[PDB]
């Protein structure tokens, strides 16, 4: 068994071989949206309200988003348009149920795509998405419309939420370093068809996430030992590690209830994230021997661009660093999981583009981080690879 | 880098270093249950559907089930009694909330005293239940009442079903032997406060679950490398697989809706699962270059009396094979994910009282078993340990 251990384990570090995005088919518009917003709702008149929705969108730095939700599906289904005055769960089960899957499908045909390899070496898949609606859960489902393996191993990742991107890629490591051969495909699917809710002035904080949620989906293959001039690596998934910020559970928090997923947001969070992040850091990079950010390329969770802001501030950072997290806030917006994909899409191919020596803007080492419920930090040490 | 993953990495195989296991005060008498549930439930009248059940239970060679739900809780929710009349998954979200994270705590605690280390040492944990109901997921509730540290890393398993007992412990081993050190609380925790509703002449196909699921958590510690003379493993996970039987996505599921969770089980289940066995069983002993199955000891979900019947049959298994998953079938019902961990304990404690040579009836290698929406099989092959 000693020697079955041994040649059972793969030998070098997990790494992503193949990135691959999309969204839905419908731009939203930042700089129009309150007025949108607030007719389809049924708020034209709640001039005060739809006053303060509108300079959280102005500052949001956010320039569009795409979303599942059109004015037609919203017009059929009045009941997602109200607060919490009746019931909508079921509503949104059923958009889920096609949506989730439906984008991951997407996300996952353009990584394969670019991965070059048959589906038919595909050892496991990693799933995450806010919610699923039934058992079996999501991953069931786009493991069937990709046409994958019965013998797929699966895992989904449910009700994680936005500190899920860094999840994943904690996982995946593990069971690509662990697993000869693996290679396994891992999915974010989001979308606010679950999250979507009229406006409230008791609830500013549901206002913010109104201002801010976006859909999408990303989809990577995940692998240690890449075949040399077959596959092509982009990062290596060096560390990880996760950590819960002390009396902050309030924070940033959800609920699935008959009137659908209704969520918190308080103020806090971008202090609550900059006071701790110092610490993550020191924990990830001391190992390395690396105490200056500067020299790192950064992919960071663009929950608020407050929360950018902060961080940014209190460590210290160029301005160039959060230049692909801010490009991704801004053409997306918030969609929580998949964000950091994106970003890592966004970097490796900027660096591609401006001739820089390594997909990590010519860096060795980068840092990769998630936030959301707990409140949660996913810490993801990456290095990059040589161009 | 190249000895950081070395350095970075265990050596053995993952073990299982403790089994806590925890229930509900409340024993339900399965022989006395069908006047119970069709009073409490409203449908005394209903005498045809009322025998249906009385024979279901009386064949379902389940003497008793722990239940969260009393006839006081059940009293003051006349919501859950109801089937589908009216909404009932918010009081059921509260009822969870609470009693999930609470037996969750009660089976860890136990897991972690046999274990005799310090909780500090944990570091990873994933937790499993059917649903959750916010955000944060049990797991974060869970790790808070044990006192874990901050910096535990928390895997949620939801909505996969009663075949994650197996999901778990495959996720558990890529975790541990990938970790050098690590030592990774595994819990389980389920009730039927999600699944429990009235009987109804219009879906039959959810009437057998009303008579055999059950409630229960389970906990282990599983770590790679056990400390000579401080830590004993009881059994190596050694392998593992997971399949999905052809077009049978409708045999087993369930959905998450304003009335609760609602499932619904085919009567093929039993057939599905034993005409796929045995192709589960050569892909995975093959190679160990084992074809005889009754020279292994056994693990089987308990999702149903027929199916354990017709895997017997079909595998020509000894009498003695299954006694164990009967006995946890008949003392705690089907518990959903929790069942083949309470199974695995029963295993290994009447092996070191029967005399048996290893914690696996005297037997080197044993397979362990999930069943679950799919139809998912959840295949884990495991080595006992020398008594
Ligand atoms: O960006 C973050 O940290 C969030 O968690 C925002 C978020 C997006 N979708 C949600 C659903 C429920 C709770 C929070 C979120
Ligand atoms: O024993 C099995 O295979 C089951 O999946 C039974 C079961 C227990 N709890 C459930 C909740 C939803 C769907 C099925 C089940």
Redesign the interface.
């Known amino acids: 068994?000693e020697g079955?251990?041994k040649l059972?384990?793969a030998?070098?570090?997990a790494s992503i071989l193949a990135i691959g995005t999309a969204n839905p088919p419908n731009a939203v518009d930042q700089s129009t949206y309150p007025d949108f917003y607030f007719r389809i709702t049924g708020n034209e008149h709640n001039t005060e309200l739809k006053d303060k929705f509108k300079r959280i969108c102005e500052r949001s730095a956010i320039k569009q988003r795409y979303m599942y939700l059109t004015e037609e599906i919203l017009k059929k289904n009045p009941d997602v348009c109200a607060f919490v005055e009746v019931?909508s769960?079921?509503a949104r089960?059923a958009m889920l149920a096609m949506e989730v899957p439906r984008l991951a499908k997407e996300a996952a045909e353009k990584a394969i795509q670019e991965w070059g390899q048959s589906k038919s070496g595909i050892t496991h898949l990693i799933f995450c998405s806010?919610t699923?609606?039934?058992?079996?859960?999501a991953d069931?489902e786009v493991?069937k419309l990709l046409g994958l393996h019965?013998?797929?191993?699966?895992?989904?990742?449910?009700?994680?939420?936005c500190f899920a991107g860094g999840?994943v890629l904690?996982?995946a490591?593990?069971?690509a370093?662990?697993?000869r051969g693996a290679r396994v495909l891992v999915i974010c699917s989001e979308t606010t068809a679950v999250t979507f809710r009229g406006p409230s002035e008791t609830h500013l904080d549901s206002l913010v996430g109104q201002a801010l949620f976006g859909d999408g989906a990303s989809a990577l293959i995940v692998g240690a030992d890449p075949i040399p001039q077959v596959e092509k690596a982009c990062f290596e998934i060096?560390?990880?590690?996760?950590?819960?910020?002390?009396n902050s559970?309030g924070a940033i928090?959800?609920?699935?209830?008959?009137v659908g997923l209704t969520?918190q947001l308080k103020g806090a969070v971008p202090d609550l994230i900059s006071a701790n992040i110092e610490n993550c850091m020191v924990e990830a990079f001391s190992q390395f021997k690396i105490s200056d950010w500067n020299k790192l390329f950064w992919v960071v969770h663009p929950g608020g661009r407050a929360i950018l802001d902060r961080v940014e501030a209190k460590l210290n950072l160029d301005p160039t660093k959060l230049i692909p997290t801010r490009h991704v806030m801004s053409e997306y917006g918030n969609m929580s999981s998949a964000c950091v994909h994106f970003i890592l899409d966004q970097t490796r191919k900027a660096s591609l583009q401006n001739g820089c020596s390594t997909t990590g803007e010519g860096l060795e080492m980068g840092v990769l981080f998630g936030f959301?419920?707990?409140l949660?930090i996913e810490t993801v040490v990456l290095?990059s690879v040589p161009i």
């Open positions: 068994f079955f251990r059972q384990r030998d070098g570090f019931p769960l079921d089960q806010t699923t609606p039934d058992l079996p859960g069931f493991a019965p013998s797929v191993k699966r895992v989904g990742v449910f009700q994680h939420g999840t904690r996982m490591k593990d069971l370093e662990n697993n060096v560390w990880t590690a996760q950590t819960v910020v002390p559970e928090g959800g609920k699935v209830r008959e969520f959301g419920p707990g949660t290095k």
